Every structure is written in structure tokens, then in C-alpha cells.
Amino acid sequence: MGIVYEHTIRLNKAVRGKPSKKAAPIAIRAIRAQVEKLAKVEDVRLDPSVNVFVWSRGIRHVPRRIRLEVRLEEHKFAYVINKDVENFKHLTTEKKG
RNA sequence: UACUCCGCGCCCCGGAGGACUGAGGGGGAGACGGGUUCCGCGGCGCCUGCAUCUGGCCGCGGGUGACUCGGGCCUAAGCGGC
Ligand SMILES: [Mg+2]
Ligand SMILES: [Mg+2]
Ligand SMILES: [Mg+2]
Ligand SMILES: [Mg+2]
Ligand SMILES: [Mg+2]
Ligand SMILES: [Mg+2]
Ligand code: NA
């Protein structure tokens, strides 16, 4: 039926309080949990594009913000895609389909 | 110093990303010692102080070619015989 979400996650907020030597894997787990909360599902599959974006600065200094693209797919699962944006000014959740 | 995503599973394999050993090497080869640990196929009963679909583990088959490389010859420090 084509239900697609658009959302941004603050990655620097999700690694507050954790050692910097494990920033990127912690960010991956935070992305998965937040997506499960947003899509009301339990099976989240991340595209390697978001993985590349998350690791683009090494293991310590993750990018500050990321804009995601969630498309829902009695066996429902969410597929997440990275969307590249020029700026995050005045960007909020959009619900399409 | 260290893993992550997807196929597929933190540990096997593949692709993509991120790192490390840093030419007195966690590289490439020999002497001594070990003695089949080497290779292919199959497997997880034991072991692989977590797991295992992995393995120097278990089963079945294979594998080392010299006129020119080394030993066999010479003699050293020595040893033996007379
Ligand atoms: Mg270095
Ligand atoms: Mg050799
Ligand atoms: Mg072998
Ligand atoms: Mg054996
Ligand atoms: Mg010769
Ligand atoms: Mg000869
Ligand atoms: Na690689």
C-alpha cells in the first residue's frame, strides 16, 4: 500500500555517556531501536548505504545528523534507506502513502 | 587499539566500509627440533576453557623425482688404533 516515513536522527545525542572507541556500533544499535519505535515493528533491515554513512568518519566521530527513509513491507518488516540532504534546517517527520 | 551492514550466523565464506602489524614485520624463506601436523573429499561423537556450519580435531583416499643443490671425500680442535 506504500506507507513510507521520513525522519531524522541526532547521532551525537545517541552516543552521550558512552566511550568514544565504540561510537559507531552504538549508533547502529540506536538507529535500530529508534526505527522500531517509529514504525511499530520488530524486524528492521538496514541498507549498507546507511552503514557506509555512519562509518564515514571512522569509529569515534560519527556524523551529527542523518535523514532516514523507512518503508514498511502477517509478516511485516521495515527497510531503511539513507537519504542525502544538503541541510537539515526545518526538517521534520513526513508520512507518505 | 576493532569491528560493522547485507547474503547468513559477534567468531566460517563473499561484497562493501572502517582499522591494525609498520621492511630489527603478526611479511617471504632456511638450520635445529617435531614426525605426517602437508593436499582433496566428507563430518561434528571428542577437543577447539563462549559458540561453531570452523579447525593443526575425527574418517577415507593421496603426496617428497637431481651428472650440475647438500651428504658420501679433505683435514681443524680432538678421538681411536699400534
Ligand atoms: Mg599504524
Ligand atoms: Mg618452507
Ligand atoms: Mg591443513
Ligand atoms: Mg588426525
Ligand atoms: Mg656441489
Ligand atoms: Mg653429489
Ligand atoms: Na574488505
UniProtKB/TrEMBL annotation:
<dbReference type="InterPro" id="IPR023621">
    <property type="entry name" value="Ribosomal_eL31_dom_sf"/>
</dbReference>
<keyword id="KW-0687">Ribonucleoprotein</keyword>
<protein>
    <submittedName>
        <fullName>Ribosomal protein L31e</fullName>
    </submittedName>
</protein>
<dbReference type="GO" id="GO:0003735">
    <property type="term" value="F:structural constituent of ribosome"/>
</dbReference>
<comment type="similarity">
    <text>Belongs to the eukaryotic ribosomal protein eL31 family.</text>
</comment>
<dbReference type="InterPro" id="IPR000054">
    <property type="entry name" value="Ribosomal_eL31"/>
</dbReference>
<dbReference type="InterPro" id="IPR020052">
    <property type="entry name" value="Ribosomal_eL31_CS"/>
</dbReference>
<dbReference type="GO" id="GO:0002181">
    <property type="term" value="P:cytoplasmic translation"/>
</dbReference>
<dbReference type="Pfam" id="PF01198">
    <property type="entry name" value="Ribosomal_L31e"/>
</dbReference>
<dbReference type="GO" id="GO:0022625">
    <property type="term" value="C:cytosolic large ribosomal subunit"/>
</dbReference>
<keyword id="KW-0689">Ribosomal protein</keyword>
